[PDB]
Amino acid sequence: SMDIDPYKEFGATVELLSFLPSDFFPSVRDLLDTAAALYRDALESPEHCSPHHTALRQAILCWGDLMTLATWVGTDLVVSYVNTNVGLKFRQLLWFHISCLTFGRETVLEYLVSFGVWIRTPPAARPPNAPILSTLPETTVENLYF
Amino acid sequence: MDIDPYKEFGATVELLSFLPSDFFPSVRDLLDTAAALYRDALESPEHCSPHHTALRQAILCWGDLMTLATWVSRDLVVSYVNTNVGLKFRQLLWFHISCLTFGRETVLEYLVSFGVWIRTPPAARPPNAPILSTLPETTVENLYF
Amino acid sequence: SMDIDPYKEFGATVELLSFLPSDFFPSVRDLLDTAAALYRDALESPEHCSPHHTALRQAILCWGDLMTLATWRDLVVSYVNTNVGLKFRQLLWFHISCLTFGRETVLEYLVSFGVWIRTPPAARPPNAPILSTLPETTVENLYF
Amino acid sequence: SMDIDPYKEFGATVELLSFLPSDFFPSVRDLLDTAAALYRDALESPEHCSPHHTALRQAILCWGDLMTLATWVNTNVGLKFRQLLWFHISCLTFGRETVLEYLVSFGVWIRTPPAARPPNAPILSTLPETTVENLYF
Amino acid sequence: SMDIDPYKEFGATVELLSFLPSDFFPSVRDLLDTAAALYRDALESPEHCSPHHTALRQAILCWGDLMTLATWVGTNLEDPASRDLVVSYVNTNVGLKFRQLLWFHISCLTFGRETVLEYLVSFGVWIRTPPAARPPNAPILSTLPETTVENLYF
Amino acid sequence: SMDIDPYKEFGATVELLSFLPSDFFPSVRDLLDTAAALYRDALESPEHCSPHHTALRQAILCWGDLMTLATWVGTNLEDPASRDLVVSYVNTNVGLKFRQLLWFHISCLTFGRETVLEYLVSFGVWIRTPPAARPPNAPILSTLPETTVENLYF
């Protein structure tokens, strides 16, 4: 069969995204609510807008199909299967496209590495708070970023 | 949020629903066909086109539905996946693969011609379906389907 | 272990030939009979003639080896037909057809037929596309 | 039927390989290992490379088919393939003319009674051995 | 026998890495995942790239041998206590050494030798200061300044 | 996981080294003793010296950790059979991979990569030739000519 990595045309890979642990990601429900609040009109547009919009439109819809299936299930372990296992895959994909629309690919990728490194540092030995996803500087007390 | 997956491609869910189920190839035949025609483009690091970007996600979505059916009482679930969700994905995968091969304008014209032909009573219509192609058939000016 | 695809030096792959359903292919016997009728003297020649001739000569002989073994019950015959037999039908056809029509025509035809056969029968033209190099044309020369 | 001799296009014959006795040839496994150590990248290449490469690819694959089926064959089939693999891999390494010469040198050596012949076999190589004008095997 | 110190050609020593306590270091698994995320393509490269890359490549493979060994024991050892004593030795006792070495190379590739060595000292000194008398947070490994409220670093 | 081939940066591969049969290689102990006798000083040096020296230094230490483990098993495991199965696994199975790697590096430091790779193929072909049909003696690893009775090598 075909080997398509959904991240590849966007300068990333499944493996890279797997560097982030599951509890880094917002829930599917909150990712969907965020795409709407930020991008509802672009997403509903007749224009492509960008490859990230095209790709995020299909993800949203696919999740819908998986949920429409769980909801049909339906009328427990199957429903759990969807929300647990399939859940993580969609959390990573929806987070990836929505964050790239917002902060751009370079920042997103830089952030995935920062957080992935921070979370793997023993808590007693690391800064108390996680690095901040942002395009804007924090600077020294030259602009500095996360 | 109401996203029609066809709308950025100049079509709509209702338009595609003009075609009855058995017009479409099987999901398995669409997937073999995407691979025979487009595997390298689909697998590449270049966007290539919006249809490629979309076709890649559909393949993978079906994959999640089929990795679900494989992960799976068992019948109603599998039959739901393959039949109903099934029809949606037949439309969607046929639409992109046909657009990449014949271009949007031909695909949309074809949808309408086939949809019209199949609704004509069999005894009153031409014996064979219109033919999807970009190439002329012509008079006995070039004439297409 | 080596990973050798016998179609690779000829511009194709195993997965490409796999797009054709088994019932597209002539039988092994009919394929061998056809190689002989068209190519017996070039295949029996001391000249290489071409890479296709070289590979076709080995395929023909390998089949002979496989048959001597397989005749050494109809569980064994259906496995052969389903697996080894199909492999050699694809391989023998590919080589004899490329010698006859050139690689480009054959590869085009592979895709035409595998697309046609996957179109629902009630929705598709009644006859298969035709393998030849010569035009059919409108009622620009148009080929299959 | 077709009477096809797989050595014919390469300037030899089935009869000519038969002049070497079975125990001259390396095993099929050692022959496959050697094709891989020496030629794997040419063999896995999208380029024909040469007629010997083309032929060698098919032999390597044919042997696999024989084993895959048989797992789902030694005194006859095995020797035929030892001959054919050896021939192609040797020609790619030393050229046809050397391999054909060596063929005849060893087959004459091995047929000379042991107490009457040199203790060691002639050596397959392209490079001279010489007198104590270059002399080869 | 030879007495080779693996840190020596990189300007450190075994004793200096021992100035850091064990729970300073990320787990082996997290170190491996980090090497990959930051350096997979270089590590898998045909080019040497640097001496740290060469050394790192070896350390990742040596760990892999120890893992294969622990799995093998899991499979092939019939006694539970034995299988468990052996696997625990690898993961804990041997793990600590590799935690130090993988950390060392991956940090050097990221921040440079000078910074890493400075950091080793800073952390080691901070952890041994009584908690009530020291800054609440550990020193921060980076190459970038924090600065006064001249650039100041950790 | 990453897939690092320890030979790749040095112009070979695991599969190529696998062309040599196990009984071609000196014992681990004899390799270690040869490393010491030829290269102890460079190996214990503060200088990188060469990419081969860096990797050899690690392989030597990795084996060291495997030996320490074998010995630990000696003291810390009760069941005679479990102990012995672990010890033979290290010496025999893991030992083969280290014989390949240590030989490879020490040989490359001595004769250079090109000579070593040529030798690898010559021996591998020789040992696969039926003994009654091949020269009585193996090909000889050296950089120096043997010549005809232009210089000729192995």
Ligand SMILES: COC(=O)c1c(CN2CCOCC2)nc(-c2nccs2)nc1-c1ccc(F)cc1Br
């Ligand atoms: C448009 O999306 C965002 O802005 C966004 C953000 C922005 N953060 C800035 C710092 O404060 C927290 C939110 N952060 C983060 C994360 N940080 C840590 C783990 S995830 N992800 C996204 C985001 C947040 C919540 C959400 F529901 C969807 C997204 Br996408």
Ligand SMILES: COC(=O)c1c(CN2CCOCC2)nc(-c2nccs2)nc1-c1ccc(F)cc1Br
């Ligand atoms: C490339 O690796 C790193 O960047 C790295 C860091 C970077 N820190 C910056 C400040 O926040 C925590 C991480 N910190 C530290 C440590 N700090 C205290 C104890 S260890 N080590 C490395 C690191 C961290 C996690 C990891 F999995 C691998 C490494 Br290497």
Ligand SMILES: COC(=O)c1c(CN2CCOCC2)nc(-c2nccs2)nc1-c1ccc(F)cc1Br
């Ligand atoms: C030399 O080989 C051929 O000429 C050839 C042909 C030619 N066709 C022209 C149209 O009528 C049917 C034969 N067709 C085809 C096919 N068409 C559909 C499926 S296979 N294959 C080859 C061929 C045919 C029969 C045969 F025994 C061997 C070959 Br090779």
Ligand SMILES: COC(=O)c1c(CN2CCOCC2)nc(-c2nccs2)nc1-c1ccc(F)cc1Br
């Ligand atoms: C790349 O895809 C195609 O070319 C294609 C075609 C082309 N037809 C030409 C006339 O003969 C039948 C095939 N026809 C048709 C249809 N016609 C009627 C109903 S569907 N769809 C596509 C197509 C066919 C089979 C398939 F598996 C995938 C596709 Br996409």
Ligand SMILES: COC(=O)c1c(CN2CCOCC2)nc(-c2nccs2)nc1-c1ccc(F)cc1Br
């Ligand atoms: C630096 O190491 C060597 O020089 C060396 C040699 C050199 N040979 C020269 C001819 O006589 C035998 C040794 N031969 C060989 C081999 N030959 C055949 C199979 S292995 N390996 C190395 C070598 C030999 C012994 C040893 F303990 C370590 C090495 Br490395």
Ligand SMILES: COC(=O)c1c(CN2CCOCC2)nc(-c2nccs2)nc1-c1ccc(F)cc1Br
């Ligand atoms: C690449 O293949 C070879 O080089 C080769 C050789 C070379 N010989 C040189 C003298 O020492 C023995 C090997 N010898 C011989 C023979 N000699 C006597 C009987 S067979 N055949 C080939 C060869 C050897 C081993 C093998 F596994 C494959 C081949 Br092909």
